[PDB]
Amino acid sequence: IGTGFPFDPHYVEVLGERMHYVDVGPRDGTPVLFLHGNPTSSYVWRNIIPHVAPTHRCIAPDLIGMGKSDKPDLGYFFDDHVRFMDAFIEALGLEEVVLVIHDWGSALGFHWAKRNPERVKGIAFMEFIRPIPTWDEWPEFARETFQAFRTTDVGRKLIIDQNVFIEGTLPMGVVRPLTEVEMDHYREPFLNPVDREPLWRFPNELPIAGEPANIVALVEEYMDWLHQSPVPKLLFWGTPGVLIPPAEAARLAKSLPNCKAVDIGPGLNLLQEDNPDLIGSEIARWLSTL
Ligand SMILES: *CCCCCCNC(=O)CN(C)S(=O)(=O)c1ccc(N(C)C)c2nsnc12
Ligand SMILES: [Cl-]
Description:
- The chain is of the alpha/beta class and 290 residues long.
- It has one domain (1-290): Alpha/Beta hydrolase fold, catalytic domain (Rossmann fold), CATH 3.40.50.1820.
- It has helices at residues 49-52, 78-91, 104-115, 140-149, 154-161, 164-172, 180-187, 197-205, 213-228, 246-255, 271-274, 276-289; strands at 10-14, 17-24, 32-35, 58-61, 97-103, 120-128, 233-240, 259-267.
- The protein has an 8-stranded mixed β-sheet with strand order 1-2-4-3-5-6-7-8, sandwiched between helices.
- Helix 3 crosses helix 9 (213-228) and helix 4 packs across helix 5 (154-161).
- The longest helix has 16 residues, at 213-228.
- It is globular, with a radius of gyration of 18 Å.
- The chain starts with 9 loop residues before the first strand and ends with a helix.
- The relative contact order is 0.16.
């Protein structure tokens, strides 16, 4: 599995800020938009894009405050990302797109697809955001850790000062052992503690046990749309998973209209890091059928 990032930088002005994105492949077709989540960047798609780039345009932005994009002093709430990603998509002059989305990128991708259904010809998704009914279902320490993250005293000392979301939570979401070179690529954006604000805000935005209600409602809305939407779907899942366990994946595979499911094998959250070749190859095959 490749550790390098051999993609030239592209930048565009979005709501007064500069956003970095990968942009490769032919212009004469339908572009594929890749949206990462917390605490990753376009780096998470590095081994998947090369399977799609030969035939389709691949666009992989770094969310505002993350990757190589600018880091303004903001709260970095979900609505803040929604606004920047909206203006990013319009800045590139994109009409119709295929979405490839993960974690908080899935929230952005689904929320966009809901509001712009005519402009979405396909949605490939994996380990995506859904409402979590209770804390009790969480594993012992994961419960303790994320409840702690969702505070201003301990959570900030953990994520901001100690950088545990990068140093601990991130590699714990990969089944295989992430190398130090790969960790360094993920560490790069957050060397300065002040730049770690999005890393702390995202876990506080997670819809867990009704809180926050605004995020829960927003998430509930795009799930309803997805059940009703006849758009083609590709759901990658792994065992035991994290946000999406194997039983939930099989359930949605049957429930969601026009939805092929793919088993990547062993996997937690960053499925891209455990089986990039299968995810990359299957997306390409799936695109050639659309
Ligand atoms: C999608 C945003 C978080 C992804 C960060 C990657 N790291 C992990 O997922 C680490 N996990 C293995 S965890 O042990 O911290 C963990 C365990 C369980 C759950 N759930 C019960 C959903 C979880 N949600 S986020 N991290 C989790
Ligand atoms: Cl998070």
